[PDB]
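Researcher: I'd like a candidate sequence for this fold, 260 residues long. If you have to choose between options at a position, lean toward the conservative one.
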């Protein structure tokens, strides 16, 4: 059975696995530790980008607003922002970089624009997400210490919210579409959820990773002949320097989407 397969995967893996699959054909779910908290790491970037998209619904100039990039802004992982030092990036470009490259500078610019991690949390609450919490900026939001509630959510909460954001009620249509375009264009997820799915399926995703071998991915999946699936796979380990384990996420994806 799918629960037995997940249990065994977890057992073998040396960690703690959290899975929430929502099948939008019938709102059925596959849940494994889905009400337990995990450090989100960069999966939290979706909430900050979406909060900016929500603002853009009532401000037509916002996404083209230029933001200065200073060498001072750079932190530990800045693939896109480092190319624009001494220049500017628009808020749309910052959303794109945060989601498609997991740029940490870009996420900090989003957070600062919004008025701090608390504001990201309030945006999640406005969507009916009672679980999400953003407490820190980049890079410290990825410390992923076992039992630390900062910068955490549950698999089910994040699957529900990702569904609302990408397929449902959270954003007006142009902004929903923009979020989906960004997720589909992610460059960091090939060995995660995507690797456990049929090649022909269309996928948008956002990865996350941190200490304690914390290895995460959240995805919206469009099968060729079926309604979409929303899948959250979170994974963490007991030792601070554990290797990250994207293969576990791919394996979980295969287990829960194999029965199609
Ligand atoms: C103190 O901050 N520590 C981080 C960290 O910055 N995590 C963030 C996060 O999630 N990111 C993702 C991410 O989305 O997974 C990638 C991934 O980018 C790519 C190209 O794969 C790059 S690191 C950034 C970290 C990461 S691993 C570890 N021990 N710590």
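Model: Candidate sequence:
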């Amino acid at each position: 059975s799918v629960q037995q397969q997940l249990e065994a995967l977890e057992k073998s893996s040396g960690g703690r696995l959290g899975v929430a699959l929502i099948n939008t054909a019938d709102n059925s779910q596959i849940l494994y530790r889905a009400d337990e908290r995990f450090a989100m790491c960069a999966t939290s970037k979706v909430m900050a980008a979406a909060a900016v998209l929500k603002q853009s619904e009532s401000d037509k100039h916002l996404l083209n607003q230029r933001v200065e990039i200073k060498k001072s802004d750079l932190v530990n992982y800045n693939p896109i922002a480092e190319k624009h030092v001494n220049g500017t990036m628009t808020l749309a470009e910052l959303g794109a970089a945060a989601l498609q490259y997991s740029d940490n500078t870009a996420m900090n610019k989003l957070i600062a624009h919004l008025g701090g991690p608390d504001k990201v949390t309030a945006f999640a609450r406005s969507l009916g997400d009672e679980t999400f919490r953003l407490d820190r900026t980049e890079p410290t939001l990825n410390t992923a210490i076992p039992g630390d509630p900062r910068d955490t959510t549950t698999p089910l909460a994040m699957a529900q919210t990702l569904k609302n954001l990408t397929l449902g009620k959270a954003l007006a249509e142009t902004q929903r579409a923009q979020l989906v375009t960004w997720l589909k264009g992610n460059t960091t997820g090939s060995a995660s959820i995507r690797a456990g799915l049929p090649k022909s399926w269309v996928v948008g995703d956002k990865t996350g990773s941190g200490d304690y071998g914390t290895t995460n991915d959240i995805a919206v999946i469009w099968p060729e002949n079926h309604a979409p699936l929303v899948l959250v796979t979170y994974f963490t380990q007991p030792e601070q320097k554990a290797e990250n384990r994207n293969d576990i996420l791919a394996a979980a994806a295969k287990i829960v989407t194999h029965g199609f």
